[PDB]
Symmetry: C2
Subunit: 98 residues, 2 copies
DNA sequence: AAATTTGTTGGAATTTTCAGCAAATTT
DNA sequence: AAATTTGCTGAAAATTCCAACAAATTT
């Protein structure tokens, strides 16, 4: 058969453990760590934008990467991401990617 | 300089920050590599799902389970927050 | 030359706000 | 005892999907 690949392990980033041994770990944990870190620096004023802040950090590379893959093809990229070609175009504007 | 970053370490044992986006980019770089021309059908909802769960989890620690403050912090309507917590079944 | 993708549309579908309950929980 | 937060609700405000089209482009 094929071995299970939980959704945690579909998008993973290389890390190193205490034994200088290279190993994948969920992207989840990077996002978890970035926030953990982000909160440390909150000393300690309010935020009103943490979603759109995060979303923007994640949307940019996704678009960046998908557009490279589809060699610039908008129709394919929007079909890959499961978003309408119109909203893809809109996002691409948002990030000056056109 | 830049608010969302994660700790890295180089061969010379020096810890050093890099922006989260660089890791998201790597994640995909990899994801694509392994697919050999296989359809990718719903990649947005995928990556969204991978980011919202940590984000929700973490703010609900910071707000101490307080749904109301978390929503104002994240900048989405309190109802949405509940609706998203349901999506991932954290409640 | 044909097939596809782009840029633009007006409308329909769905998602998120928003204020306003009383009831329940925290202070 | 008071203040805050929750679980819920309609309905408005915004965003997303749609699908169709000529025109630009890629095959």
């Amino acid at each position: 058969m094929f071995e299970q690949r939980v959704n945690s392990d579909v998008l993973t980033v290389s890390t190193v453990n205490s034994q200088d041994q290279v190993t994948q770990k969920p992207l989840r944990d990077s996002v978890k760590q970035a926030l953990k870190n982000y909160f440390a620096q909150l000393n300690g004023q309010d935020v009103n934008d943490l979603y759109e802040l995060v979303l923007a950090e994640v949307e940019q590379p996704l678009l960046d990467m998908v557009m490279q893959y589809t060699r610039g093809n908008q129709t394919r990229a929007a079909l890959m991401m499961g978003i309408n070609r119109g909203t893809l175009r809109k996002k691409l504007k948002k990030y000056g990617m056109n």
